[PDB]
Amino acid sequence: KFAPNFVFGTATSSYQIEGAHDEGGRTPSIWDTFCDTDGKVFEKHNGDVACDHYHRFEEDIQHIKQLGVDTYRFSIAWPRIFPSKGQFNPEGMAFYKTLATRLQEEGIKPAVTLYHWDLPMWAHEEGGWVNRDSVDWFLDFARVCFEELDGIVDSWITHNEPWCAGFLSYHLGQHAPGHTDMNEAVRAVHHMLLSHGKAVEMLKGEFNSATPIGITLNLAPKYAKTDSINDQIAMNNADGYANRWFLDPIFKGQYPVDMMNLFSKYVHTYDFIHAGDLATISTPCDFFGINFYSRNLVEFSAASDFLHKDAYSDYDKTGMGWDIAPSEFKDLIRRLRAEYTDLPIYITENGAAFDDQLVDGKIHDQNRIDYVAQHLQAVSDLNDEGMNIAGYYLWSLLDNFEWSFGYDKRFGIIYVDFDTQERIWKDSAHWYANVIQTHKAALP
Amino acid sequence: MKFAPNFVFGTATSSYQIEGAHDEGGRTPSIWDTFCDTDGKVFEKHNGDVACDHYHRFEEDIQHIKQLGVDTYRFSIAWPRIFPSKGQFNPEGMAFYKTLATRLQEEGIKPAVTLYHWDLPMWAHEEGGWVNRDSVDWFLDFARVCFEELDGIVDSWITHNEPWCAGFLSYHLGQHAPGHTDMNEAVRAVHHMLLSHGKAVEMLKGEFNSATPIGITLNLAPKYAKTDSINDQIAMNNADGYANRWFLDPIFKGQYPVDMMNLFSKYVHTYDFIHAGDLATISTPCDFFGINFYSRNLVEFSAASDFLHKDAYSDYDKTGMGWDIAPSEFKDLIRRLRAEYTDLPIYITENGAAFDDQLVDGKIHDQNRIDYVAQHLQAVSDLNDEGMNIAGYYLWSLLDNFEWSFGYDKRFGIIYVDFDTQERIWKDSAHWYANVIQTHK
Amino acid sequence: FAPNFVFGTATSSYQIEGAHDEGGRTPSIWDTFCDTDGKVFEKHNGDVACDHYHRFEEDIQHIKQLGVDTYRFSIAWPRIFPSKGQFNPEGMAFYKTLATRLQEEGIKPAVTLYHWDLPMWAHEEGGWVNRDSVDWFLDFARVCFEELDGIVDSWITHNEPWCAGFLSYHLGQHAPGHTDMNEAVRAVHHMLLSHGKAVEMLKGEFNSATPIGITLNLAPKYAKTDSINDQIAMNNADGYANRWFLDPIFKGQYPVDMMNLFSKYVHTYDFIHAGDLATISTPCDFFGINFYSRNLVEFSAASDFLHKDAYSDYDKTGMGWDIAPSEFKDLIRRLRAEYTDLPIYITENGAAFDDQLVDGKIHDQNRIDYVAQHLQAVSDLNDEGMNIAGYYLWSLLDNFEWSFGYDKRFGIIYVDFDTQERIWKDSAHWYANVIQTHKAALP
Amino acid sequence: FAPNFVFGTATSSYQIEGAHDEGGRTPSIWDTFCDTDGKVFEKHNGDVACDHYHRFEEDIQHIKQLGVDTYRFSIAWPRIFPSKGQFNPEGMAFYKTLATRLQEEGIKPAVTLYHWDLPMWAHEEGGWVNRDSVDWFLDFARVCFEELDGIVDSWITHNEPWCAGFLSYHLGQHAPGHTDMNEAVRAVHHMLLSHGKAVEMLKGEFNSATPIGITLNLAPKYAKTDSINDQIAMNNADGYANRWFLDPIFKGQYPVDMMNLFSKYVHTYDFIHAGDLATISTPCDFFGINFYSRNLVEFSAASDFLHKDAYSDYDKTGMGWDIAPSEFKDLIRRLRAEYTDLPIYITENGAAFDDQLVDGKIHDQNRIDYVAQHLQAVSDLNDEGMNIAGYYLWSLLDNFEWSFGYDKRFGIIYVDFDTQERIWKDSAHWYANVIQTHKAALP
């Protein structure tokens, strides 16, 4: 059961679906160059064509309208809007203005993500997010988006998963630009978080707008394999690296000193945190976005710099090898209310990848239906406790370019044949439409 | 400047600093005897062989204490007198302390007894010392014997004096005995001392069924950031964790501070020496909290330092040690402990200062020391008006004594000691302190 | 190839023997490691394996049919000492029978003492981390020298201390799966010391002139770019994999650059006693090399040891390992230049590919190609005077491939693990013919 | 001593000149460092110093009366370039006049370009941490070469880059007093790179044969015990103090064992550009050594570089430094064996002792003894063919001794800093006689 004001939704990002990579004045992003770099992405796959959504946006709007979702979440491609530094590209902005206007016409609330990892190559070449100037480049991008789209757009999300864009990209080398440097990584994270707060301030101050704005963090709760002191330190450090490094500056206006000390094996000055920065980072928002996928069971490692490694999990697992963990999702939400925030929470991404077999114009993904149903049940149980999860966005609308895995993994509720660009609904899409329908059918 | 009727004025010493008679009464060498004889470790090879010769002249020193009018006299028991070999109780050594405590009761003086004031027997050291977990049990054999023989006579017990000094200053920084430089040894040493504290409180309250007040003494130095920069805040935090929170958190919160555990992980790569049930024992409820206070430290950030901090320049008035005179920062510290840590009654188990004392025509005009003590007693009074419940103040020290690695080069006493003749001469501060006590009464 | 050149094939005890609880055998670290969750592919073990304990006579005929000069096998420690100080004469009798039979069939037995099957009783006392493991191993080695030195042709003390040490105690991939750099360097030191003591014992106590040596796996390391950063990266990968083992064995010292790099985890080297390094570096008769691939590496600021794997565009095996015969030639040249002038034996070389059985035959041309390129390299190097005296083809049988289990097939003879049927792959016929051709060249 | 042996004495500009804000001079890092609280002994500074800028003629007569062959002094950078790009001819004229007057009095001017007085303007742009410092220093060196090469007898580019680099940017004891290992290695690299560029400029552009070289302070390091730990400690102390500077200068490379140890703080070496090390290792005419003492070291698990000072039972100077003439001999033999065959000059040797002025005389028999033992060692080494071509006694005058201020007296001539009176110590008379005795020996 869900409340009458509960928002069902689905979501995508620009580089994962759009394609048309050198069309409409678009110039290359870090992910274009990363896909072309040897050994970084699965079988050299890229987002040149992707789901061809830039051309086929109208067909996909109908699919969204057919699902009956209250809200559609999408991201704006920075390299379409500012293909060069200081050079606005109005053709790029028109596409999004048309996309948002068409969604509104169809009774669909547009929820817009400003940054979903597609940094322009001109920005990267000046240091990217490692450079403090990146705060001001992003503000020019945001200003132009607010000025042209704030009358149409229903909600703004400044940043999607700064852990991925920051740590996974600059420390672990898995995402673009694929660096392995903790110093660059903490500087990148700080400038993303600061750009978040400057953008919120700009919307509410300069533009005098009451459009709901917030951030989205990916959160993965961390559990100790045993109750030994070592394994408690492992959990703590994993929690701090994945969660508290981002939650503390956003809601407390401080970085966790335990992680600062732990990172001091690589980071030997924090003078990049200027005075006034953490107050701006912690500027009050209208909601809090959460991307949730799984937990991580950890144990202690004497040979790890950050004192933790992954432990063996006996849980049921997705196609990615990630734990299916709705009980731990409930722990996470409870903790955020206890420790961090009383803001309305939106689950801005939840979903799963399974080995989907297309067989005779049909995809039987009972496993994806299970996953989503367990989490929606966990959302309903939490709302009965008073945890205030106002909405939920199913990731993803269609099968799309899944980053370093390429098209090898399929997260979509709608199947996509990538050589014909045919959309075929999966059983989970039918099920999800009917969940929204059955919900809507009983409400006033 | 006024103190409640139940307020306790006192003075204090430790065994190795004053007793002398190092090879007499069955006493075998401690870590400090061998440290003093190890080259480059102590000022001009000075040692505690003779010291104040207090072991022979205890009666004379009781008269001085009696004349001062102090409610309480704090002294330490020498472990190597009581257990000169492992498992070998020496009853002659115990007899001295029984006599000492009995005589103090006769002269109307409350005896406050420190079990461990750094004088670890050499036999313990040779088996690994405090780095070894058996050190918990060796200390418990020592403490059991002391409780059995003296609990009826002694007014209050102090398990450990300054585990930071015995642990970090001794096993990490290498300044005190046994002078090691190993962070892993150091955190094992600290842990076993703290665990031996908790086991002894448990022992006295449970085995002996005694209600005699027991607690610990920690030396606490509040830490201040030179500037408001993030770097300097990290420096303050890490200095405060290293000096203070590493000891406060296990005692009162039953946990170690994880920010310091992570910082120490540059050297310490497993915390499995912390067994399950240890931190609950370490944090066993005490009857009072003991604080040794001397100064603050102003710190700034250092990128080249493993713990991210160095000392910054201080413009404050300084003692003969070069330590800041810091009564305001003492007030910050007490307020913080009430706000974050404990509501137990606090005893300032050591406070004092070293200055360049000159004997002139049979007198020592140590007005600088008087000033120092006075500024802190004023702080104690002002803090008690706020409800901070500092129930006692012990002036360090009774006699000029052996000042550890500085030797006899530094004089902390309120009674001057000519170490050639062993003559006791009252400094101006002793007469002043005796009169402060009278005034209170 | 020269007339004295030895062709061989090789196995290890836990990988093929099976009969895990039979003949008085007690568990090893690998038995337990297989039965720990998440450590081995689909929980596979060496309980049954190739059933070679029972079927050894059949396999002796296969070896004989191959025409190999030498067969290399390992002795299972837990069969010889199933409990501490408790000698098992049944366990020894098997290996005595095996070696005598091979001698009767005209085959040289080359014997590996330690191939990773540490008894559980030794692990429960600390294992290789404990200095007493040197003495435990000597008791094991003494018994093997006493009962077999007359029968055996050559002795190999240790197989791949990098694997048994660093992969096992630092990286956690092999048994017992620990992740502690301090345990790892002690483990390695005691393995290398036990080697040195065992060589001293054979030549001193027993007065024997039987050829003895050690086997190190070696993987040459290459910098992605010519920058200073990537030179450090290569230096450190090389030190971690190769120099940490080569320097003590041949120079009687550890490389200080690695000691300094390891000092982020290791804060005392007092486990290296006086006399140990002179014992570790005791003169051997040959040097053994297990070779498989190179590694292309680059610099990483976020890595404690300053290197990570760089993208390789080389042809790869079924394992993803680079097929790297040119780099094999670089390595051998380096060893003659820097380290040793002893006769080299390639004690393991081979590859794994996706082998299918079709119509009673395995068409492993990929494996033939691999082996051919390396045998060519050996022949080229021996023309330069590099003195590679022999080559063993890993492996005789498809076997238990450690953390990969039975998912990976390295054998020249296919094994159906359900039936225990031996089927010759194309590579076995080919290799037998390579040997035949070499023999036909000899006068 | 041999017929071509050079006896000398030495000073540096900030230590003796004073006149800090006169002649167009702007502040150096040391002026600002002296005004920074807690850095220098009782806030002492080089404002007046020995007032040698005004009293240079008197001090020349003292040098003349000493009978030294050579006088080594340094040029104050802020007198020559008080602002970036602005040449100051009044400042240059002073050093031209000084050098000319020394030539007229039969004295060889040996000139040090950099003796730690970096102009403040250079500091405010990052200083030695900035790669531009190489070019700033080259503009300064060019101007000195253009105006003084005819007059000057020998050039020293840099004095003690260990102090100006590691003691200044890592340990925080000298100006600008930073504690950052990353800044420290960049500083050292740029100093060494500026050395090599300056040597190239003198021999290439100016086409000059004037002898040029670097001066390194060298402290040989010794293990307390024979244990492995203590060998690592000695190795690391030697690398930090000596090999880090010797290897680039003579081998064109940095020692990788130290790069690995410094990687706890230094996470990229891209500041070392291609070509730099070949420029740094450009061939010089002589090698300069500042020698003072040894250091006995032992292992420390709590230390990042694995070493701490060990107790020494040697006779000590007033600084607490070991009097170590035997160890000096070890150093010189090591340099010939491992590094260079250039003629060596001891560009600084000397000692501080608690000098008391008594009845217009200073009885510094302790300083006499020290210098005698080292001059004996020099003579003994030259009998072995070690080719020490000269000795400069540090110092001519009691002077501003850096972070110790005027609390420590290294001079052979006493200076009453309250009155600026020069008074010859017994060592000065003695030293003059030693030179006299040596001259009387030559035909």
Numbering used by the authors:
A (entry chain A): 2 to 445
B (entry chain B): 1 to 441
C (entry chain C), D (entry chain D): 3 to 445
Paper text:
β-glucosidases are key enzymes in cellulose depolymerization, acting synergistically with endoglucanases and cellobiohydrolases. Recently, we have characterized a cold-adapted member from Exiguobacterium antarcticum B7 (EaBglA) with higher kcat over mesophilic counterparts at 30 °C141516. Besides being cold-active, EaBglA is also glucose tolerant, indicating that cold-adapted GH1 β-glucosidases might be instrumental to make biofuels production via SSF economically viable. Crystallographic studies showed that the (α/β)8-barrel fold and the catalytic residues Glu162 (acid/base) and Glu350 (nucleophile), typical of GH1 members, are conserved in EaBglA.
Hydrodynamic studies using SAXS and AUC indicate that the EaBglA tetramer is stable in solution. Each pair shares the same entrance and forms a huge cavity [11393 Å3 ± 216 (mean ± SD)] with a two-fold symmetry. The γ interface forms a semi-circle wall at the catalytic face of the TIM barrel, connecting the active sites from neighboring subunits. EaBglA crystallized in slightly different conformations, as indicated by the structural superimposition of the independent tetramers observed in the P21 and C2221 crystalline forms. These conformational changes result in variations in the surface area buried into the tetramer interfaces and in the volume of the active sites, suggesting that EaBglA forms a flexible oligomer, which possibly contribute to overcome the structural rigidity imposed by low temperatures.
